Scaffold this active site. Structure first.
Site, PDB file in Angstrom:
ATOM      1  CE  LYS A   1      -3.837   4.888   0.527  1.00 13.21           C
ATOM      2  NZ  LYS A   1      -2.416   4.709   0.900  1.00 13.21           N
TER       3      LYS A   1
ATOM      4  CG  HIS B   1      -4.796   9.726   0.624  1.00 11.92           C
ATOM      5  ND1 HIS B   1      -3.437   9.676   0.410  1.00 11.92           N
ATOM      6  CD2 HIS B   1      -4.996   9.226   1.871  1.00 11.92           C
ATOM      7  CE1 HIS B   1      -2.836   9.199   1.488  1.00 11.92           C
ATOM      8  NE2 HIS B   1      -3.762   8.919   2.390  1.00 11.92           N
TER       9      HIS B   1
ATOM     10  CE1 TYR C   1       0.299   7.985   2.673  1.00  9.62           C
ATOM     11  CE2 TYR C   1       0.876   5.730   2.068  1.00  9.62           C
ATOM     12  CZ  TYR C   1      -0.011   6.633   2.609  1.00  9.62           C
ATOM     13  OH  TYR C   1      -1.219   6.183   3.093  1.00  9.62           O
TER      14      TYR C   1
ATOM     15  CG  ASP D   1      -1.850   1.253   1.247  1.00  9.04           C
ATOM     16  OD1 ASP D   1      -2.967   1.211   0.706  1.00  9.04           O
ATOM     17  OD2 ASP D   1      -1.415   2.278   1.797  1.00  9.04           O
TER      18      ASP D   1
HETATM   19  N1  LIG Z   1      -5.640   6.317   3.891  1.00  9.46           N
HETATM   20  C1  LIG Z   1      -5.012   7.150   4.734  1.00  9.46           C
HETATM   21  O1  LIG Z   1      -5.385   8.501   4.854  1.00  9.46           O
HETATM   22  C2  LIG Z   1      -3.908   6.613   5.603  1.00  9.46           C
HETATM   23  C3  LIG Z   1      -3.402   5.340   5.333  1.00  9.46           C
HETATM   24  N2  LIG Z   1      -2.411   4.765   6.073  1.00  9.46           N
HETATM   25  C4  LIG Z   1      -1.773   3.532   5.530  1.00  9.46           C
HETATM   26  O2  LIG Z   1      -1.745   2.496   6.503  1.00  9.46           O
HETATM   27  C5  LIG Z   1      -0.412   2.146   6.837  1.00  9.46           C
HETATM   28  C6  LIG Z   1      -0.275   1.717   8.308  1.00  9.46           C
HETATM   29  O3  LIG Z   1      -0.605   2.754   9.205  1.00  9.46           O
HETATM   30  P1  LIG Z   1       0.504   3.659   9.969  1.00  9.46           P
HETATM   31  O4  LIG Z   1      -0.103   5.015  10.067  1.00  9.46           O
HETATM   32  O5  LIG Z   1       1.810   3.514   9.306  1.00  9.46           O
HETATM   33  O6  LIG Z   1       0.641   3.062  11.474  1.00  9.46           O
HETATM   34  P2  LIG Z   1       0.759   1.546  12.047  1.00  9.46           P
HETATM   35  O7  LIG Z   1      -0.386   1.253  12.924  1.00  9.46           O
HETATM   36  O8  LIG Z   1       0.945   0.454  11.079  1.00  9.46           O
HETATM   37  O9  LIG Z   1       2.061   1.615  12.998  1.00  9.46           O
HETATM   38  C7  LIG Z   1       3.332   1.816  12.425  1.00  9.46           C
HETATM   39  C8  LIG Z   1       4.409   2.027  13.480  1.00  9.46           C
HETATM   40  O10 LIG Z   1       4.467   0.935  14.375  1.00  9.46           O
HETATM   41  C9  LIG Z   1       5.816   0.550  14.540  1.00  9.46           C
HETATM   42  N3  LIG Z   1       5.915  -0.869  14.904  1.00  9.46           N
HETATM   43  C10 LIG Z   1       5.597  -1.947  14.118  1.00  9.46           C
HETATM   44  N4  LIG Z   1       5.832  -3.062  14.840  1.00  9.46           N
HETATM   45  C11 LIG Z   1       6.292  -2.722  16.068  1.00  9.46           C
HETATM   46  C12 LIG Z   1       6.682  -3.472  17.182  1.00  9.46           C
HETATM   47  N5  LIG Z   1       6.599  -4.803  17.166  1.00  9.46           N
HETATM   48  N6  LIG Z   1       7.122  -2.822  18.323  1.00  9.46           N
HETATM   49  C13 LIG Z   1       7.174  -1.442  18.361  1.00  9.46           C
HETATM   50  N7  LIG Z   1       6.783  -0.710  17.253  1.00  9.46           N
HETATM   51  C14 LIG Z   1       6.351  -1.338  16.124  1.00  9.46           C
HETATM   52  C15 LIG Z   1       6.514   0.867  13.229  1.00  9.46           C
HETATM   53  O11 LIG Z   1       7.894   1.103  13.399  1.00  9.46           O
HETATM   54  P3  LIG Z   1       9.047   0.097  12.886  1.00  9.46           P
HETATM   55  O12 LIG Z   1       9.248   0.328  11.409  1.00  9.46           O
HETATM   56  O13 LIG Z   1      10.360   0.452  13.554  1.00  9.46           O
HETATM   57  O14 LIG Z   1       8.726  -1.337  13.216  1.00  9.46           O
HETATM   58  C16 LIG Z   1       5.765   2.110  12.788  1.00  9.46           C
HETATM   59  O15 LIG Z   1       6.428   3.295  13.179  1.00  9.46           O
HETATM   60  C17 LIG Z   1       0.404   3.361   6.401  1.00  9.46           C
HETATM   61  O16 LIG Z   1       1.770   3.110   6.210  1.00  9.46           O
HETATM   62  C18 LIG Z   1      -0.322   3.793   5.136  1.00  9.46           C
HETATM   63  O17 LIG Z   1       0.020   2.981   4.021  1.00  9.46           O
HETATM   64  C19 LIG Z   1      -1.876   5.445   7.150  1.00  9.46           C
HETATM   65  C20 LIG Z   1      -2.294   6.724   7.519  1.00  9.46           C
HETATM   66  C21 LIG Z   1      -3.380   7.443   6.754  1.00  9.46           C
END
Ligand SMILES: NC(=O)C1=CN([C@@H]2O[C@H](COP(=O)(O)OP(=O)(O)OC[C@H]3O[C@@H](n4cnc5c(N)ncnc54)[C@H](OP(=O)(O)O)[C@@H]3O)[C@@H](O)[C@H]2O)C=CC1
Ligand SMILES: NC(=O)C1=CN([C@@H]2O[C@H](COP(=O)(O)OP(=O)(O)OC[C@H]3O[C@@H](n4cnc5c(N)ncnc54)[C@H](OP(=O)(O)O)[C@@H]3O)[C@@H](O)[C@H]2O)C=CC1
Lengths: 328, 328
Positions: B86, B117, B57, B52
């Site tokens: 998006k 989006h 981004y 995704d």
């Molecule tokens: N349609 C929209 O308007 C939006 C869509 N989205 C989409 O959804 C995706 C996911 O949502 P997102 O907002 O990124 O947030 P998430 O809920 O997926 O959380 C992501 C964070 O969690 C951390 N993480 C993952 N595993 C662990 C762990 N085991 N322990 C501690 N930390 C952890 C990651 O860091 P690390 O890399 O170090 O593991 C990262 O910084 C986005 O990337 C995007 O593609 C997101 C926001 C808006």
């Protein structure tokens, strides 16, 4: 409701090709060959994307007719489906011929998976009312199976490899085997080039086949479980522990016996001609390690091999005497 | 060991296209945009078949480079992958342009899913150091978001439909929306033609979004859950019951917060840049109806909306004030 359905699960073959974990089996009684068409249509509309058939079943034309109708009315595309068929021991040394015959019957340009049906070679006996003018399972006047003398079962697989590796031949997407033992797989791996993507075998709680599962996992081969309900009359539904676990996870007996395989990463092909039965039984019961352990214990304790016809007797694991009724 | 892996589950969109239930999210910090490449490569080698991304981004080029390298070394084919991107509100009325820009950045001929989006329209403010020469989220001197006055958010979706329905145009395989409320979906359904295949929204145990889920199911739209771990710092792993259920089903917290969505037929896209974290967290915890009930209870009781930035404030579901810290 709750997911995944068993129609929603896909395993990966060793050539990177995806296969739906759940398929429709079509080895239907000779009396009901035509009823296959409606069963396939019902399966696909309920979400199945995998059909298992074979040259020897005589159901290929009815699988083809079902697919043709769903293609024509726009309910499905060809690339959405996974079709498996098999080469029978009577054509052990004529794989090209078998495939082309299967293709013509199915009304298809390619199949997704082509299997060697048995590690066996039969003599070609003419019969105009047989399949392609040939006796399916030839026996002599004594009543014993007529095997091809100096026939090597591995010749079949070599002919499969040729077609699969021909870069200008698009008739198959994957090859495999069925009813191979560990020993036969080892010989194949030693002597051949293409690792079979699947070994399709009888397995279920009455025949857990632990050793073969382990072996295939070690050598990059998926199991496909046939007769997962125990064939005619689905005797495996009448196992108490099956009825019990079905109850816990809120699923049908069929669901549980499907899930037993999918949970362990085994592809499964239950057969039915019943549209409502096919349609409902797509729930997943995600069995615990311990529940699997119990199920497997049971099969160790009470082994029943339902598919053990006389022609198979010459193979190590097979007796030719059919099921041990006592273990039911 | 046990199956399905969450990489092995596929849901069906309302146009018959299958989508992998589990995707890799790529909204990575501006400081780490480059690290997306390794994360995508690691996801795909671990079995993810869904990425995704978005025009906004700035990670598209890195997703593209990862894909290009796996295509080149023969680890994957393009037809094996599902790519979502998006259209951002700054290009609300220039979808063709946004798509083509995304395609160029991705190094791809088509995407599988193209989403609106936000149900929003932004003014176009030039910045040479912005994305495609534009400010991403324009705010005036007062600090207020610069919306395009007389811009209708549904113009974006109309432009999506044109491209999706053009029979000589093969750049998309599906269209959808993101951050739409029930009211906005209703207006879309009344005034448009193509039913969105997905509505991508924030959801997880701290924001169960029961009403929207129900609505989309009734109207043939799948939910895709974004920020399923609660975004920055993954606060959702710290919920006690999440830690409890992970324990029972013998999976990690990530697995459980993934399984929460997949079990309810919701597509989910957790984000990570950590190769070992991505690779291990592919197990499925098949939650009971009751355990789902408990998790949903908790979010209804303790709602936290982590994604609620000022620009979103004009949408009735959003505050602009960010998360309610109190409910953690
Ligand atoms: N349609 C929209 O308007 C939006 C869509 N989205 C989409 O959804 C995706 C996911 O949502 P997102 O907002 O990124 O947030 P998430 O809920 O997926 O959380 C992501 C964070 O969690 C951390 N993480 C993952 N595993 C662990 C762990 N085991 N322990 C501690 N930390 C952890 C990651 O860091 P690390 O890399 O170090 O593991 C990262 O910084 C986005 O990337 C995007 O593609 C997101 C926001 C808006
Ligand atoms: N590779 C090989 O050598 C072999 C491969 N196979 C393949 O595997 C498939 C499955 O195996 P198969 O041998 O057919 O046996 P199965 O274990 O699938 O059992 C099939 C029988 O169970 C019955 N059944 C299903 N559900 C119920 C129910 N709820 N209550 C009562 N009865 C029920 C069906 O009848 P009903 O139609 O009325 O539902 C059917 O006759 C085959 O069709 C074939 O494709 C099979 C044998 C050998």
């Amino acid at each position: 409701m709750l997911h995944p359905k068993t129609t929603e699960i896909y395993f990966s073959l060793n050539n990177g090709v995806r296969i739906p974990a759940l398929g429709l089996g079509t080895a239907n009684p000779h009396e009901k060959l035509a009823e296959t068409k409606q069963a396939v249509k019902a399966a696909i509309k309920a979400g199945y994307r995998h059909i298992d058939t074979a040259w020897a079943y005589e159901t290929e034309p009815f699988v083809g007719e079902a697919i043709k109708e769903l293609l024509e009315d726009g309910s499905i595309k060809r690339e959405d489906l996974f079709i498996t068929t098999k080469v029978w021991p009577v054509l052990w040394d004529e794989v090209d011929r078998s495939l082309n015959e299967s293709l013509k019957a199915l009304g298809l340009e390619y199949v997704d998976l082509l299997l060697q049906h048995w590690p066996l070679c039969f003599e070609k006996i003419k019969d105009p009312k047989g399949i392609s003018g040939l006796v399916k399972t030839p026996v002599d006047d004594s009543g014993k199976t007529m095997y091809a003398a100096d026939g090597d079962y591995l010749e079949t697989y070599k002919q499969l490899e040729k077609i699969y590796l021909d870069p200008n031949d698009h008739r198959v997407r994957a090859i495999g085997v069925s009813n191979f033992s560990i020993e036969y797989l080892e010989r194949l791996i030693k002597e051949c080039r293409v690792k079979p993507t699947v070994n399709q075998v009888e397995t279920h709680p009455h025949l857990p086949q632990m050793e073969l599962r382990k072996f295939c996992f070690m050598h990059d081969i998926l199991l496909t479980a046939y007769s997962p309900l125990g064939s005619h009359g689905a005797p495996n539904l009448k196992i108490p522990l099956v009825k019990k676990l079905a109850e816990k996870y809120n699923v049908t007996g069929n669901d549980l016996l499907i899930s037993y395989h999918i949970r362990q990463g085994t592809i499964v092909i239950p057969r039915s001609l019943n549209p409502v039965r096919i349609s409902s039984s797509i729930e997943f019961a995600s069995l615990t390690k311990d529940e699997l352990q119990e199920l497997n214990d049971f099969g160790e304790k009470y082994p029943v091999r339902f598919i053990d016809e006389p022609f198979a007797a010459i193979l190590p694991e097979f007796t030719g005497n059919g099921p041990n009724l006592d273990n039911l």
